[PDB]
Amino acid sequence: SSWWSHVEMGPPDPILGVTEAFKRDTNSKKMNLGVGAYRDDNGKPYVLNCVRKAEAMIAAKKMDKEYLPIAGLADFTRASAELALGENSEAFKSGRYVTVQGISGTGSLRVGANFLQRFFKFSRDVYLPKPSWGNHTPIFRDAGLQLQAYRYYDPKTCSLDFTGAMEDISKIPEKSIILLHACAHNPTGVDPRQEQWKELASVVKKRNLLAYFDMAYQGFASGDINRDAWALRHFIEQGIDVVLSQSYAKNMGLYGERAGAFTVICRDAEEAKRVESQLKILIRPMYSNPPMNGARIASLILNTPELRKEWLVEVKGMADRIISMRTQLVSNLKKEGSSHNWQHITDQIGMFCFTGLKPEQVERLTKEFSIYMTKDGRISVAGVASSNVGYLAHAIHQVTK
Amino acid sequence: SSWWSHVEMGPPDPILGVTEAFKRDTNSKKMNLGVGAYRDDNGKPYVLNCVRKAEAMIAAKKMDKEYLPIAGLADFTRASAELALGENSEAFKSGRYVTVQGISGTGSLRVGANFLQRFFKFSRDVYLPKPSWGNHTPIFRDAGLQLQAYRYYDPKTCSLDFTGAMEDISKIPEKSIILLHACAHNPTGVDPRQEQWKELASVVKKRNLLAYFDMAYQGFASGDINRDAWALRHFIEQGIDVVLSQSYAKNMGLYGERAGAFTVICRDAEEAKRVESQLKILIRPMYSNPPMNGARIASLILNTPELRKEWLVEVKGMADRIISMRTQLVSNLKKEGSSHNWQHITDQIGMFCFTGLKPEQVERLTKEFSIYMTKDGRISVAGVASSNVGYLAHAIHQVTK
């Protein structure tokens, strides 16, 4: 029958648009700055060394393919909580958290969203920073929640609109939900500094808000696992019982294996068990039980001292290269004689950098230099390499002069 | 804090209770007839040889771990449609279908349910057979649909209530959604015979209902992939545009890897593309993209003639062991001098058997013989081995005399 005749073609992804054009282009100087995953100095995908080793170990052990418990691989969940909270964290040692395996960060966000829709009786409003990762909208919207915003990004400075944020958060009706990026804000790269974080916590705590941390770049941002989880741990220390989403897509290069976890900070171990039971009832009818590969690999690395050690060197390598490219970019623009202030480029943290380029300049860059990026002036630092940072500096200048 | 004080401990799982209870038992003759997965003759998990062959191939190539498209691995989806529909199916050849990778069977059903909630404007009603897999309820309910039922299982004969089914479907409001198990009904093992299927088709066609096929046991039920897809293929041939969910959990032993697919039979290629666009928009906020491992393994096997061929031998090997245990249970029950009719045991198909046992009998069985099963009298045939089938038979006779 003609059941779907009324179904219209959904809109095309602007992001896919840029990568399709990049692919068509024959100029060997082409650059893809819309890329969403890490790339090495050669512009190639990168499977960590400790990943290959973990993998090799699994093969050796001739493990079965049996179903994992609903909540996932217990060695993976425990290790996940420990990674996030810190070993000597009171939350962790008291076992007053509940961690469940989710389908990477996205799945983990969704599960958390479905959990709040069901049990967070106090409000349906989720406040996102302006701007946020595109997916954040439909995630919360599809789960049945209401969307709100708080100023975050400042276009004047390509930095934190600290005054704007504080004024916005200050007017948040008590017992509302606020989504915060732990580090390496997507898509701006603009993160609060320690001092800003401390004032943010104070008000979150004061207005008695439910803080929902999105931690998708732990270790990948600064190169330090402890530094990256700083804000999140600060909140929990100040008595803010958060909810959290962790992704291993970037820090482990696990992209397609989809490994992540959803965590709930509870009053105690008693309550944690109750929440856990409820999280299980929710997930069953979603997908029953999670993909085991990614978790097995992740658990082995975090759980195996020789592997974990290698993992930290490797993760650090990734982060150092991105910083390097940022550094080189600013220095090269000066070298080109750019009068403009490009500090933001080096103040910004992680994979994404909001250049401050305007839509017209982006166009010149694409049309004239074969540099592919979105019209918002957002560049993926992963697409920069030692071999082309110069070229990019050149082009940016040409179009900004 | 204290956001969660009101969250209560969720109901304990029955299936789980029997596995746990079993574990804690000391009898050496104890048996677990509650197992939800296939077990070999020694009562052990079984990774297909063809599966190991596939993993070794992937390993040698040194593949990346990059994100798959939202819809999943194209080699996987195409192959999935092909296995279901049949190589020379008209639906296949015209390209008037759309198949997206799902998180095994559960995940595929959920996407499908969410999709219907969103676009199936003709009704909110889903008709499940009485009885069905527990999970079927929350899947639909959580998706936002209303559940109804049609008579299926006949407790008096432990066979199909064909009459009641035919009468019930005849009275189902037009353009309603009806869930059908392609083969090896879970939990009864009661399936319509080819001739009864032909009759059901006609009624479904006439009432102009949307048939939602749940195919979790293709090839694993009877040892023949084509024979198992019979009913599915007949509906389509008759001009009923179904929607379908596939699982590779059982047939390939991919349990924990989570390999599945959701398919929509459309009017044409043009509508197929509109539908796929909309399915992508739905999944994104669910989990972004699917786990790659299972899809990789599945695809290699389906696409490589040599592996595909070995697979068909292994699947057949699985179906036969099961059929053997059924044959042997009955014969051992007679042997014992049991006077009851146990033909149902051999009449039934697949891993699950509705024995007809009553609760208190089940109780004595657990208590007195150390035989673990659900109180509904359902047993997993996978839990029966040649070495213990005699033991089972004796126990049942004892409890039923």
Ligand SMILES: Cc1ncc(COP(=O)(O)O)c(CNOCC(=O)O)c1O
């Ligand atoms: C803040 C943030 N949270 C969460 C996530 C989710 O990441 P994943 O689902 O890969 O774990 C992302 C991932 N972005 O990359 C995926 C994409 O844009 O298609 C992210 O930036």
Ligand SMILES: Cc1ncc(COP(=O)(O)O)c(CNOCC(=O)O)c1O
């Ligand atoms: C008819 C039917 N459909 C769909 C499914 C879903 O199976 P899966 O999600 O493992 O692919 C099942 C799975 N049953 O066993 C799985 C379990 O109880 O954990 C099923 O029997």
